[PDB]
Design an enzyme around this catalytic site. Structure first.
Site, PDB file in Angstrom:
ATOM      1  N   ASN A 272      14.093 -12.857 -41.871  1.00 59.36           N
ATOM      2  CA  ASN A 272      14.459 -13.637 -43.044  1.00 59.36           C
ATOM      3  C   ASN A 272      14.164 -12.713 -44.221  1.00 59.36           C
ATOM      4  O   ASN A 272      13.006 -12.387 -44.485  1.00 59.36           O
ATOM      5  CB  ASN A 272      13.616 -14.901 -43.154  1.00 59.36           C
ATOM      6  CG  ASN A 272      14.075 -15.800 -44.279  1.00 59.36           C
ATOM      7  OD1 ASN A 272      14.472 -15.335 -45.354  1.00 59.36           O
ATOM      8  ND2 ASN A 272      14.031 -17.093 -44.042  1.00 59.36           N
TER       9      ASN A 272
ATOM     10  N   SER B 168      27.548  -3.325 -44.868  1.00 60.34           N
ATOM     11  CA  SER B 168      27.764  -1.899 -45.139  1.00 60.34           C
ATOM     12  C   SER B 168      26.537  -1.024 -44.947  1.00 60.34           C
ATOM     13  O   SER B 168      25.453  -1.357 -45.420  1.00 60.34           O
ATOM     14  CB  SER B 168      28.294  -1.723 -46.562  1.00 60.34           C
ATOM     15  OG  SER B 168      29.621  -2.185 -46.624  1.00 60.34           O
ATOM     16  N   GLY B 169      26.731   0.103 -44.257  1.00 61.66           N
ATOM     17  CA  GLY B 169      25.651   1.027 -43.978  1.00 61.66           C
ATOM     18  C   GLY B 169      24.914   0.672 -42.694  1.00 61.66           C
ATOM     19  O   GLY B 169      24.117   1.472 -42.196  1.00 61.66           O
TER      20      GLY B 169
ATOM     21  N   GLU C 199      12.438  -6.716 -40.787  1.00 64.42           N
ATOM     22  CA  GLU C 199      12.894  -7.936 -41.416  1.00 64.42           C
ATOM     23  C   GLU C 199      13.697  -8.854 -40.525  1.00 64.42           C
ATOM     24  O   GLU C 199      14.334  -8.405 -39.580  1.00 64.42           O
ATOM     25  CB  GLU C 199      13.822  -7.592 -42.592  1.00 64.42           C
ATOM     26  CG  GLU C 199      13.152  -7.041 -43.825  1.00 64.42           C
ATOM     27  CD  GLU C 199      12.486  -8.121 -44.663  1.00 64.42           C
ATOM     28  OE1 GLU C 199      12.251  -9.239 -44.163  1.00 64.42           O
ATOM     29  OE2 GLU C 199      12.209  -7.853 -45.843  1.00 64.42           O
TER      30      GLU C 199
ATOM     31  N   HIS D 247      28.587   5.174 -49.516  1.00 62.82           N
ATOM     32  CA  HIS D 247      28.974   4.243 -50.562  1.00 62.82           C
ATOM     33  C   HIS D 247      27.869   3.255 -50.940  1.00 62.82           C
ATOM     34  O   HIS D 247      28.012   2.491 -51.888  1.00 62.82           O
ATOM     35  CB  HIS D 247      30.301   3.547 -50.226  1.00 62.82           C
ATOM     36  CG  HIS D 247      30.181   2.352 -49.337  1.00 62.82           C
ATOM     37  ND1 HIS D 247      30.459   2.388 -47.985  1.00 62.82           N
ATOM     38  CD2 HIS D 247      29.922   1.049 -49.626  1.00 62.82           C
ATOM     39  CE1 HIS D 247      30.384   1.172 -47.481  1.00 62.82           C
ATOM     40  NE2 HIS D 247      30.062   0.342 -48.458  1.00 62.82           N
TER      41      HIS D 247
ATOM     42  N   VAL E 290      11.873 -14.378 -47.193  1.00 64.24           N
ATOM     43  CA  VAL E 290      10.509 -14.832 -46.963  1.00 64.24           C
ATOM     44  C   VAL E 290       9.691 -13.738 -46.308  1.00 64.24           C
ATOM     45  O   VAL E 290      10.224 -12.973 -45.504  1.00 64.24           O
ATOM     46  CB  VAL E 290      10.492 -16.049 -45.994  1.00 64.24           C
ATOM     47  CG1 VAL E 290       9.070 -16.391 -45.561  1.00 64.24           C
ATOM     48  CG2 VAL E 290      11.151 -17.255 -46.648  1.00 64.24           C
TER      49      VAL E 290
ATOM     50  N   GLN F 255      31.300  -7.365 -46.321  1.00 65.00           N
ATOM     51  CA  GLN F 255      30.564  -6.833 -47.465  1.00 65.00           C
ATOM     52  C   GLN F 255      29.086  -7.217 -47.289  1.00 65.00           C
ATOM     53  O   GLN F 255      28.779  -8.356 -46.923  1.00 65.00           O
ATOM     54  CB  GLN F 255      31.128  -7.449 -48.750  1.00 65.00           C
ATOM     55  CG  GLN F 255      30.957  -8.966 -48.787  1.00 65.00           C
ATOM     56  CD  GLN F 255      31.914  -9.698 -49.725  1.00 65.00           C
ATOM     57  OE1 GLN F 255      31.528 -10.121 -50.821  1.00 65.00           O
ATOM     58  NE2 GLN F 255      33.139  -9.936 -49.257  1.00 65.00           N
ATOM     59  N   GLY F 256      28.183  -6.268 -47.496  1.00 68.52           N
ATOM     60  CA  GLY F 256      26.767  -6.552 -47.337  1.00 68.52           C
ATOM     61  C   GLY F 256      26.224  -6.006 -46.027  1.00 68.52           C
ATOM     62  O   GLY F 256      25.019  -5.771 -45.891  1.00 68.52           O
TER      63      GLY F 256
ATOM     64  N   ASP G 137      34.041 -10.225 -37.418  1.00 65.42           N
ATOM     65  CA  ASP G 137      34.052  -8.912 -38.047  1.00 65.42           C
ATOM     66  C   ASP G 137      32.772  -8.703 -38.865  1.00 65.42           C
ATOM     67  O   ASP G 137      31.943  -9.616 -38.987  1.00 65.42           O
ATOM     68  CB  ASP G 137      35.253  -8.895 -39.007  1.00 65.42           C
ATOM     69  CG  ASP G 137      35.646  -7.500 -39.476  1.00 65.42           C
ATOM     70  OD1 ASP G 137      35.097  -6.478 -39.005  1.00 65.42           O
ATOM     71  OD2 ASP G 137      36.549  -7.437 -40.331  1.00 65.42           O
ATOM     72  N   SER G 138      32.556  -7.474 -39.329  1.00 67.29           N
ATOM     73  CA  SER G 138      31.440  -7.197 -40.224  1.00 67.29           C
ATOM     74  C   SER G 138      32.071  -7.485 -41.590  1.00 67.29           C
ATOM     75  O   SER G 138      33.286  -7.708 -41.681  1.00 67.29           O
ATOM     76  CB  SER G 138      30.947  -5.745 -40.120  1.00 67.29           C
ATOM     77  OG  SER G 138      31.996  -4.804 -40.269  1.00 67.29           O
TER      78      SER G 138
ATOM     79  N   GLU H  89       6.913  -7.020 -41.753  1.00 69.39           N
ATOM     80  CA  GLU H  89       7.687  -6.237 -42.721  1.00 69.39           C
ATOM     81  C   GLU H  89       6.946  -4.999 -43.179  1.00 69.39           C
ATOM     82  O   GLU H  89       5.724  -4.975 -43.218  1.00 69.39           O
ATOM     83  CB  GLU H  89       8.011  -7.053 -43.979  1.00 69.39           C
ATOM     84  CG  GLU H  89       8.959  -8.228 -43.783  1.00 69.39           C
ATOM     85  CD  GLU H  89       8.246  -9.572 -43.703  1.00 69.39           C
ATOM     86  OE1 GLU H  89       7.015  -9.595 -43.502  1.00 69.39           O
ATOM     87  OE2 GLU H  89       8.923 -10.608 -43.833  1.00 69.39           O
TER      88      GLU H  89
ATOM     89  N   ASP I  27      31.710   8.882 -44.914  1.00 69.72           N
ATOM     90  CA  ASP I  27      30.883   7.832 -45.487  1.00 69.72           C
ATOM     91  C   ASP I  27      29.560   7.722 -44.714  1.00 69.72           C
ATOM     92  O   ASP I  27      29.351   6.799 -43.919  1.00 69.72           O
ATOM     93  CB  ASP I  27      31.644   6.513 -45.463  1.00 69.72           C
ATOM     94  CG  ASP I  27      30.971   5.430 -46.290  1.00 69.72           C
ATOM     95  OD1 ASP I  27      30.074   5.743 -47.090  1.00 69.72           O
ATOM     96  OD2 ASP I  27      31.346   4.257 -46.132  1.00 69.72           O
TER      97      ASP I  27
HETATM   98  C1  LIG Z   1      40.689   0.252 -52.068  1.00 68.96           C
HETATM   99  C2  LIG Z   1      40.924   1.294 -50.972  1.00 68.96           C
HETATM  100  N1  LIG Z   1      41.418   2.542 -51.378  1.00 68.96           N
HETATM  101  C3  LIG Z   1      41.463   3.145 -50.121  1.00 68.96           C
HETATM  102  C4  LIG Z   1      41.904   4.469 -49.793  1.00 68.96           C
HETATM  103  C5  LIG Z   1      41.870   4.880 -48.438  1.00 68.96           C
HETATM  104  C6  LIG Z   1      41.421   4.009 -47.416  1.00 68.96           C
HETATM  105  C7  LIG Z   1      40.990   2.691 -47.716  1.00 68.96           C
HETATM  106  C8  LIG Z   1      41.010   2.246 -49.078  1.00 68.96           C
HETATM  107  N2  LIG Z   1      40.639   1.009 -49.618  1.00 68.96           N
HETATM  108  C9  LIG Z   1      40.116  -0.222 -48.949  1.00 68.96           C
HETATM  109  C10 LIG Z   1      38.604  -0.392 -49.006  1.00 68.96           C
HETATM  110  C11 LIG Z   1      37.767   0.756 -49.122  1.00 68.96           C
HETATM  111  C12 LIG Z   1      36.361   0.633 -49.172  1.00 68.96           C
HETATM  112  C13 LIG Z   1      35.771  -0.672 -49.091  1.00 68.96           C
HETATM  113  C14 LIG Z   1      36.626  -1.840 -48.973  1.00 68.96           C
HETATM  114  C15 LIG Z   1      38.046  -1.696 -48.931  1.00 68.96           C
HETATM  115  N3  LIG Z   1      35.882  -2.993 -48.914  1.00 68.96           N
HETATM  116  C16 LIG Z   1      34.597  -2.441 -48.989  1.00 68.96           C
HETATM  117  C17 LIG Z   1      33.394  -3.403 -48.932  1.00 68.96           C
HETATM  118  N4  LIG Z   1      32.717  -3.497 -47.611  1.00 68.96           N
HETATM  119  C18 LIG Z   1      33.301  -3.925 -46.361  1.00 68.96           C
HETATM  120  C19 LIG Z   1      32.597  -3.687 -45.164  1.00 68.96           C
HETATM  121  C20 LIG Z   1      33.142  -4.097 -43.925  1.00 68.96           C
HETATM  122  C21 LIG Z   1      34.421  -4.763 -43.851  1.00 68.96           C
HETATM  123  C22 LIG Z   1      34.980  -5.184 -42.631  1.00 68.96           C
HETATM  124  N5  LIG Z   1      34.496  -4.899 -41.438  1.00 68.96           N
HETATM  125  N6  LIG Z   1      36.078  -5.910 -42.527  1.00 68.96           N
HETATM  126  C23 LIG Z   1      35.106  -4.983 -45.089  1.00 68.96           C
HETATM  127  C24 LIG Z   1      34.558  -4.574 -46.316  1.00 68.96           C
HETATM  128  N7  LIG Z   1      34.417  -1.041 -49.106  1.00 68.96           N
HETATM  129  C25 LIG Z   1      33.171  -0.219 -49.199  1.00 68.96           C
HETATM  130 CA   LIG Z   2      11.079 -11.181 -44.497  1.00 69.92          CA
END
Ligand SMILES: Cc1nc2ccccc2n1Cc1ccc2c(c1)nc(CNc1ccc(C(=N)N)cc1)n2C
Ligand SMILES: [Ca+2]
Length: 223
Positions: free
Chosen positions: A54, A177-178, A52, A40, A57, A174-175, A171-172, A62, A84
């Site tokens: 910071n 990710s990966g 990396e 994703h 900067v 957005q950002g 928790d982890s 790097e 994923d």
């Molecule tokens: C919207 C939806 N349709 C689904 C169908 C099946 C299973 C989950 C589903 N979701 C929830 C969902 C799916 C993908 C998502 C998401 C929330 N939120 C993100 C953004 N990144 C992200 C990364 C880590 C965390 C966390 N650890 N709490 C929370 C969010 N991605 C990349």
């Molecule tokens: Ca740097």
């Protein structure tokens, strides 16, 4: 990372930042020319930033290397987030040293209770947005399958596992990710998704890397 701590410069040498004029996803260096991340996180015009701390900067250590190709798992499903996982081949080999090193792929899957280190430059707030300059870290255990499926009924596939705290607060996010989920020196997970961040009874969901070792090896060997 919500509820974590500052890792300390270059203490997570395999951590990578995916950049396209700004940081958008994390990744893990698995050898001198390959990075593993989340499907994703796919996008064209990716620059991989190694060594990396910071991200705003240039402090030294790097290495900015363009991606020559990004291989999204052929069976990745964007609606369910199943499979994923993505492999990124670097345009040139990274210079491996003390601050830039690869992480090992697992030979077996990790069991519930296993403590792992999760890291990244993602959002640090449950409510709202706050992106850090430096790398944040979090220690979290792999949850049981039963607890994982109870938290996300019908959404957990065999290629996913939950890690974190049911009480919320850590928790982890957005950002992140990966990014890597490293347990006992092996890359066991890839930050994938979750419902909100650090919410009660909504732990993070991660891509189960042990199910992809053969695919990773076969793909790298042919590219
Ligand atoms: C919207 C939806 N349709 C689904 C169908 C099946 C299973 C989950 C589903 N979701 C929830 C969902 C799916 C993908 C998502 C998401 C929330 N939120 C993100 C953004 N990144 C992200 C990364 C880590 C965390 C966390 N650890 N709490 C929370 C969010 N991605 C990349
Ligand atoms: Ca740097």
């Amino acid at each position: 990372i919500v509820g974590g701590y500052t890792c300390g410069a270059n203490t997570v040498p395999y951590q990578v930042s995916l950049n396209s004029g700004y940081h958008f996803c994390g990744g893990s260096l698995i050898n001198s020319q390959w990075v593993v991340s989340a499907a994703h996180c796919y996008k064209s015009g990716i620059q991989v930033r190694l060594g990396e701390d910071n991200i705003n900067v240039v402090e030294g250590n790097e290495q900015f290397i363009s991606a020559s190709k990004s291989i999204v798992h052929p069976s990745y499903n964007s609606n369910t987030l199943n499979n994923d996982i993505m492999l990124i081949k670097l345009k040139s080999a990274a210079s491996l040293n003390s601050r830039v090193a690869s992480i090992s792929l697992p030979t077996s899957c990790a069991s519930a209770g296993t403590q792992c280190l999760i890291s990244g430059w993602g959002n640090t707030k449950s409510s709202g947005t706050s992106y850090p300059d430096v790398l944040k870290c979090l220690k979290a255990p792999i949850l049981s399958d039963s607890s994982c499926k109870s938290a996300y009924p019908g959404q957990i596939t065999s290629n996913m596992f939950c890690a974190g705290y049911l009480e919320g607060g850590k928790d982890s996010c957005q950002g992140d990710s990966g990014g890597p989920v490293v347990c006992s020196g092996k890359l066991q997970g890839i930050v994938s998704w979750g419902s909100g961040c650090a919410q009660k009874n909504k732990p993070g969901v991660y891509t189960k890397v042990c199910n992809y070792v053969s695919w990773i090896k076969q793909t790298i060997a042919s590219n």
